[PDB]
Design a protein around this ligand. Structure first.
Ligand SMILES: Nc1ncnc2c1ncn2[C@@H]1O[C@H](COP(=O)(O)OP(=O)(O)OP(=O)(O)O)[C@@H](O)[C@H]1O
Ligand SMILES: Nc1ncnc2c1ncn2[C@@H]1O[C@H](COP(=O)(O)OP(=O)(O)OP(=O)(O)O)[C@@H](O)[C@H]1O
Ligand SMILES: [Mg+2]
Ligand SMILES: [Mg+2]
Lengths: 470, 55, 478, 240, 354, 119
């Protein structure tokens, strides 16, 4: 009596008719398992998600996979709950799809394991934290010029060849080492080749054992590409709520999540809003983002890679995304070519936390002075190129001299780069980096060679390196 | 000699001022272009949907 | 009374609606009374929406439509090599039947994320600009995007011709073109001898829209047979924008909700399904691979259009061709600045990789400072050298139609350019110098060419230098 | 009309000249009936079956073994927008393309054919000859280079230019004015009878202009001339 | 029995249709089987359109809908001072229930032409730039407009804090904000002592669109109680832009034809009937007042856009915050060229005018 | 109503001349924005000189503006308006600063201004 029946199929959309009084709730998951009865049928293993109640005991659903081979009239069963995915330590080191089934070849999770619903309300007002707290990452440039906030959302800008994956791996390693918290990666709209390459990169780096990886591939239907971020979020939320840890959540691209939502809305037939986006763009973005917050017992910090359509920052999707961000990190190809492997732009990067109320007066002053010096050095590039170095004034000479030290000291040697370099990685506390930059600004190390500042950690490693050079 | 030095300095200053004005105009025109593009997309999709649902 | 037959209710614009057919599958293939075939897309409560794969003028309301019981599929096999067929696998060249003994479904799952391998083998296209600045690897999918009359078809034909000595099978899919144009392309391939390893799939502009919609899937289905039996395949789709337009026509005729530019909701899913099946299989699944070169035609260079945006977001790289660059004498017309490849380095041999970085730097320095051509015509210490090197680089990167170049000669000419042996030669003499150097190479530097071919690395520097000055002594500057 | 032409193509093996007036009107009428036929609208208000109808019409105009049909078609471009769906779709079916520009029309140059946008697959060295190919490519390159210099000249004047681009522009003006011609049907508009120029003399005149044999002639003497002797005659009649 | 009981026939995207409810009155509150409230929007011939004010995932076709007999209303009173509540008056701070006694309708007519008086009392915000160049009086509607991250929330919090000694009840309405930011704002107000006279109405971005739609009306209805008791009230709306976005979402879910920028036709009426309820009453009516400070977020400083122009056409002047000036070290970056107070100056003390 | 038989010949001619000058100034705007007045000809600079003063003299102080600013309003007869614009077009007041023409009534008020400041 809990059985349904396929009645109408139109591409990725399926309508199911149920017995009167036994309709499934919105967002429930429906399963179809069909064995070919004869030579004119094919086997079906498909999952649907309830979207609307059309009336007359009919429900409209969105398919999570290909609907080819469906026949009007086959049996649909109701699971009685939304999509449920495994949680706990069994998810660490594994790769999952949107349904929560393992994708790697390491077997399947037993049915005895705990599973949690994908859809749930955001934490209530009185469960949230009251004070803003800084998340120490151990990376000098991030900790100085764009501090991270526990429970905040950080936008990541860049592209290929700037070390985005290397930075992600270093963040995972540092957070796990110095805070004890796991990280989760959500590949929304992930290219399969890049997903395989990233999996092998993580396996080589060794951070795979402390991360849970979820892929919604680009060839999957819009419903799956829309829902993969939520299963990643659920896997993070388990550790946030039960273990009391501080967890990182990585979203491969959130614009793809918004465009999948737009495609789902278009398939459902809703009247388009904005330029072409769904009417519920802000609602969907808020429902996704408001679950990434700090609570009384833990927090989730999320780093989103953001794509801007047509370079228009006033486009509705970037405009909605920016309303939730607390920081911004930009990766610079010029710095990558110059040899700054962190590649974080020191002037284009901004953060809401860079205010003396929460970070400290000395930290604020040091950051402001460093940014001013870097801007001053940037302004002189054309005149230096045209006339030459010797044509500048004495103060310009000093500014260039100190800025070329600061630019090099903004770099760092990463743990994950040891497999290629041979040099062990470093974890630099915020106090140490602030004091080092203050000392450099004061001119304490103007006599040192500039290459000594290249790929060192604290302010003593540069002295040791320079002494080793001679 | 002073006349030639003044002429070259004046050319340099005038040209940099012109370049700055051109960059500002480019920025404003780009903003206008993006607004017009968004408006065009919205109008086109609204007309298409109205025609579709008029049936 | 039965559920295996139906009666047609509505006919028009190449689609029909039928009552009955209670047990038809979604995507199934059906047959009408007069012998034309159809594919069932829409399964409503009381009727079935059918697209017609042939002349629909002979179909009237009330005639019978029957089940076939099979999801749509195409014939596969080695017998298709050298033939011209339609997306249904029926020959149109008029040379008789095809005689294949196996079939493969149109829609098949893409290889899993754990069945794949990193792209590490070069796909030599024979175009110097592509091989040096925008490398393509086996298993990669690279978008070729540009306006009309810019050279995309010529690039594809040269790439297919260059695969003669390699071990790859080529598939050319023509969507929405003139049959005369397709026949001219086939004649060019036959003339150059590429038709003994190439398969051509044709869906002309006079064919019904579902055939244009289904052609790329037939192409990838034919390629996947060789891919999964262990071989390497190259597939070219001539106009994905035309394929998308045909799909939009079908969707609008079936009354599905429209989106931006009246496209259906799953238009991105369509191209993702198509392009995600190109992969590089792991050694456990066999060493086979399939590489795709989709084509997109932009309007007035607008790459912010909906379909171009989708395909750019899907593919692994872009190759941009510009009309002004095409008409300024640069016939390859490849915009080396906008073009990008995310498999660079891994898709190149060591010898090419050792010179490609310097070539890229020299071209990037010259693309800026273009305003400084007229200004500062007097002597300058640095910018004059940069402009002189950039002009010769641009002259070197030019290439004639249907003249692929071996990689062992491309490496040598790029080495000669980058190391400064072209500096004392006028810009007008650069192409003649290159041609005479190629003629000199196969006459005397056979040992260098064999060393490059066998070791995939640069020859000995001093011997290469001696060869270059020996040729320069003979060369006559005009 | 196509049905009348196909009989002569097939049943008699003739060579048929099919002059078709504005193709755009056929597509426009197809779109006019589309909404009343009950079909959903498309991107720019056109019918969904635009490309299918266009191809079904165009593919019948072809040369076969029995005979050859050559067709010359005028195509309207709405509001000079070449990205409009109908002209954009029409490009796929054409072998040669001639583009007319309002900029050239207003300047007084007729037929106002754009020398850079116009294309033809018959322009190959093995088809027209190596000399013809060289002359055509040199003319196109000279015009493209001259187009670039105009941006500089508009700000800095002609005097700032060097003495080789000076010659470049001085010959490009001559080439641009020599691309004009006086038509037989333009006699009603201008009072001057038209002229017929063979391709050999066209190539010879353009090659001579490129080599500078007539560099001393005044610029205005090249407008609406025809042959290369006629510009010399005009220059003689108006002074030099 | 279909007079006071109905049955759901459709559910989707927060909109439901119900069969029955023969005696329901337009604008009534209805209650679903699980306790979620709804509003009777459309009364058709054989069905009723209901807007769901809460999570709609628990509402299924065939569920029971029950009448309440009350027009849309919210609880009001002095017991609500110092609490954080949702647009329905339900507390969210966890400090227990609120003991109110009476209610006011969400939709109420504005004071008439003859019921008003000229603005003549200064409202001291404590910000030198505002108090010197763009004065604000009691009963005025002043718009604060600027880009994101320009200090609008900080200006509002400073204004609310400064009202300690003056007899001024403050209401802070947050539409579409982040719950963490609302928590931080509440903690700042608690530290500075503002919860002795402040009410906070919150509807975050994770809430359904109808609640963001209804929050400003709940706030103004709460303020009108003290206004008509003869007191002075200050009301801050944090994102009228987000309220308009939520209303656009609702209208498009109802399949209404959109206009400029896909907004509905009555997008102007939405804000006008809200902002017309702030006024300075006459001596006959009691001399109460209500001051409104709506916020509008612009894109790249474009004040010629639809919503900015609509709000400018309603209020009595705007304070424009400049984004590039905000980066010049002047944190209260008021653009004095584009800022004006129409009914200011008269509501300014003698010394400051001189 | 702007017709010679309704407003008078000199009124019509003054209006047309003012509009012509303003149109020329509007046409010069893009060049002025890009590279300033330094590359304008002598007549173009005179056109700009007259047009800025005309545009500023088109301003007026209203009676109802007493509430915003303390300056009292002014009522200007059409004869005075025509005479003042004719005098400006004839070049009588090319030496006065352009800020003296802002928010005044008769041309006598323009003359009285620039005396409270430098003349
Ligand atoms: N490298 C080249 N050298 C010389 N001519 C070239 C070269 N590449 C292309 N061409 C010529 O330029 C024209 C481009 O035609 P092609 O078919 O290659 O372009 P396309 O991008 O497919 O455009 P379309 O089919 O829309 O005209 C042809 O006449 C071709 O012969
Ligand atoms: N007067 C001031 N002095 C110092 N810092 C200030 C001042 N005003 C605002 N700020 C800071 O500048 C930032 C502006 O944030 P605020 O919330 O006030 O602005 P907003 O425009 O409402 O922001 P949002 O778009 O995030 O809602 C905050 O970090 C705030 O602490
Ligand atoms: Mg082509
Ligand atoms: Mg704020």
């Amino acid at each position: 009596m809990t059985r349904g029946r396929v009645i109408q199929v139109m591409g990725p959309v399926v309508d199911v008719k149920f017995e009167n009084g036994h309709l499934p709730a919105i967002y429930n998951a429906l399963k179809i398992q069909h064995k070919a009865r004869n030579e004119n049928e094919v086997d079906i293993d498909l999952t649907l998600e309830v979207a609307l109640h059309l009336g007359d005991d009919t429900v409209r659903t969105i398919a999570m996979a290909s609907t080819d081979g469906l026949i009007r009239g086959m049996e649909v069963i109701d699971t009685g709950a939304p999509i449920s995915v495994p949680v706990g330590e069994v998810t660490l080191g594994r790769v999952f799809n949107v349904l929560g089934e393992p994708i790697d070849l390491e077997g399947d999770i037993p049915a005895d394991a705990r599973r949690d619903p994908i859809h749930r309300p955001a934490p209530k007002f009185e469960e949230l934290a009251t004070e803003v707290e800084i998340l120490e990452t151990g990376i000098k440039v991030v900790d100085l010029l764009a501090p991270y906030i526990k429970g905040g959302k950080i936008g990541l800008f860049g592209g290929a060849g700037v070390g985005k994956t290397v930075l992600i791996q270093e963040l995972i390693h540092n957070i796990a080492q110095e805070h004890g918290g796991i990280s989760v990666f959500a590949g929304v709209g992930e290219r399969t080749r890049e997903g395989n390459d990233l999996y092998h990169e993580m396996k080589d780096s060794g951070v795979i054992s402390k991360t849970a990886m979820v892929f919604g591939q680009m060839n999957e239907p819009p419903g799956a590409r829309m829902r993969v971020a939520l299963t990643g979020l659920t896997m993070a939320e388990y550790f946030r709520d039960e273990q009391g840890q501080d967890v990182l959540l990585f979203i491969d691209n959130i614009f793809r999540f918004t465009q999948a939502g737009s495609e789902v809305s278009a398939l459902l037939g809703r009247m388009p809003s904005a330029v072409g986006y769904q009417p519920t763009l802000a609602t969907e973005m808020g429902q996704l983002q408001e679950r990434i917050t700090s609570t009384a017992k833990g927090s989730i910090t999320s780093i989103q890679a953001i794509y801007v359509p047509a370079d228009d920052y006033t486009d509705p999707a970037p405009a909605t995304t920016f309303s939730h961000l607390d920081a911004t990190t930009n990766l610079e190809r010029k710095l990558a070519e110059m040899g700054i492997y962190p590649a974080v732009d020191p002037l284009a990067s901004t953060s809401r936390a860079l205010a003396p109320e929460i970070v400290g007066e000395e930290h604020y002053q040091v950051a402001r002075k460093v940014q001013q010096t870097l801007q001053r050095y940037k302004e002189l590039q054309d005149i230096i190129a045209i006339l030459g170095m010797d044509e500048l004034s004495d103060e310009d000479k000093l500014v260039v001299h100190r800025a070329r030290r600061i630019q090099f000291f903004l770099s760092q040697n990463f743990h994950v780069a040891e497999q290629f370099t041979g040099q062990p990685g470093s974890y630099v506390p915020v106090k140490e980096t602030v004091r080092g930059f203050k000392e450099i600004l004061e001119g304490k190390y103007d006599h040192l060679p500039e290459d000594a500042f290249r790929l060192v950690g604290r302010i003593e490693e540069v002295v040791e390196k320079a002494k080793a050079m001679g | 000699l002073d006349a030639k030095a003044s002429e070259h300095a004046a050319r340099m200053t005038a040209m940099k001022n012109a370049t700055d004005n051109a960059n500002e105009l480019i920025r404003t025109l780009t903003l206008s272009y993006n607004r017009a593009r968004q408006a065009a997309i919205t109008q086109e999709i609204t007309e298409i949907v109205a025609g579709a649902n008029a049936l | 009374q039965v559920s295996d037959v139906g009666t047609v209710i509505q006919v028009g614009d190449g689609i029909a609606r039928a009552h009955g057919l209670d047990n038809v599958m979604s995507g199934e293939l059906v047959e009408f009374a007069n012998g034309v075939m159809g594919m069932a897309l829409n399964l409503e409560e009381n009727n079935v929406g059918i697209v017609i794969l042939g002349p629909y003028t002979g179909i009237k309301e009330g005639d019978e439509v029957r089940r076939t019981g099979r999801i749509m599929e195409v014939p596969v096999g080695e017998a298709l090599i050298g033939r011209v067929v339609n997306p249904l696998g029926q020959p149109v060249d008029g040379l008789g039947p095809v005689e294949t003994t196996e079939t493969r479904p149109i829609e098949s799952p893409a290889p899993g994320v754990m069945d794949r391998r990193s792209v590490h083998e070069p796909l030599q296209t024979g175009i110097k600009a592509i091989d040096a600045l925008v490398p393509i690897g086996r298993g990669q999918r690279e978008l070729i995007i540009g306006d009309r009359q810019t050279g995309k078809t010529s690039v594809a034909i040269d790439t297919i011709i260059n695969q003669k000595d390699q071990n790859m099978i080529s598939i050319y899919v023509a969507i929405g073109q003139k049959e005369s144009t397709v026949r001219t392309v086939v004649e060019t391939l036959r003339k150059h001898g590429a038709l003994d390893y190439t398969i051509v799939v044709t869906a002309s502009a006079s064919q019904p829209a579902p055939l244009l919609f289904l052609a790329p899937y037939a192409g990838v289905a034919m390629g996947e047979y060789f891919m999964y039996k262990g071989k390497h395949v190259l597939v070219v789709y001539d106009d994905l924008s035309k394929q998308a337009a045909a799909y939009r026509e079908l969707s609008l005729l079936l009354r599905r909700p429209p989106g931006r530019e009246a496209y259906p909701g799953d238009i991105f899913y369509l191209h993702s399904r198509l392009l995600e099946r190109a992969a590089k299989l792991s050694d456990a699944k066999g060493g086979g691979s399939l590489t795709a070169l989709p084509f997109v035609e932009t309007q007035a260079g607008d790459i912010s259009a909906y379909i171009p945006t989708n395909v750019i977001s899907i593919t692994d790289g872009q190759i941009f061709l510009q009309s002004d660059l095409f008409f300024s004498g640069v016939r390859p017309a490849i915009n080396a600045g906008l073009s990008v490849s995310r498999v660079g380095g891994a898709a190149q041999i060591k010898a090419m990789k050792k010179v490609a970085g310097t070539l890229r730097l020299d071209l990037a320095a010259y693309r800026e400072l273009e305003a400084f051509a007229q200004f500062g015509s007097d002597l300058d210490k640095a910018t004059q050298a940069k402009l002189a090197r950039g002009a010769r680089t641009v002259e070197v990167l030019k290439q004639d139609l249907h003249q692929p170049i071996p990689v062992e000669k491309q490496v040598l000419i790029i080495y000669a350019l980058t190391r400064g042996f072209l500096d004392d030669i006028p810009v007008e003499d650069v192409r003649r110098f290159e041609k005479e150097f190629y003629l000199f190479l196969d006459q005397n530097g056979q040992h260098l060419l064999e060393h490059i071919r066998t070791t995939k690395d640069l020859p000995n520097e001093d011997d290469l230098n001696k060869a270059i000055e020996a040729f320069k002594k003979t060369f006559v500057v005009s | 009309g196509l049905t009348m032409a196909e009989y002569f193509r097939d049943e008699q093996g003739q060579d048929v000249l099919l002059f078709i007036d504005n193709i755009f009107r056929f597509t426009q009428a197809g779109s006019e009936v589309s909404a009343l036929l009950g079909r959903m609208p498309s991107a720019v208000g056109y019918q969904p079956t635009l490309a299918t109808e266009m191809g079904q019409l165009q593919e019948r105009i072809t040369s076969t073994a029995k005979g050859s049909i050559t067709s010359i078609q005028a195509i309207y471009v709405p509001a000079d927008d070449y990205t409009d769906p109908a002209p954009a779709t029409t490009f796929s079916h054409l072998d040669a393309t001639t583009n007319l520009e309002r900029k050239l029309a207003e300047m007084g140059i007729y037929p106002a054919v754009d020398p850079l946008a116009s294309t033809s697959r018959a322009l190959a060295p093995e088809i027209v000859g190596e000399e013809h190919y060289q002359v055509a490519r040199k003319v196109q390159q000279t015009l493209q280079r001259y187009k670039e210099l105009q941006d500089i000249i508009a700000i800095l004047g002609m005097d700032e230019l060097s003495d080789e681009d000076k010659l470049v522009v001085h010959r490009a003006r001559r080439i641009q004015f020599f691309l004009s011609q006086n038509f037989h049907v333009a006699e009603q508009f201008t009072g001057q009878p038209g002229s017929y120029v063979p391709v050999k003399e066209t190539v010879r005149g353009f090659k001579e202009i490129l080599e500078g044999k007539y560099d001393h002639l005044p610029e205005d003497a090249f407008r609406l001339v025809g042959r290369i002797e006629e510009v010399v005659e005009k220059a003689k009649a108006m002074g030099v």
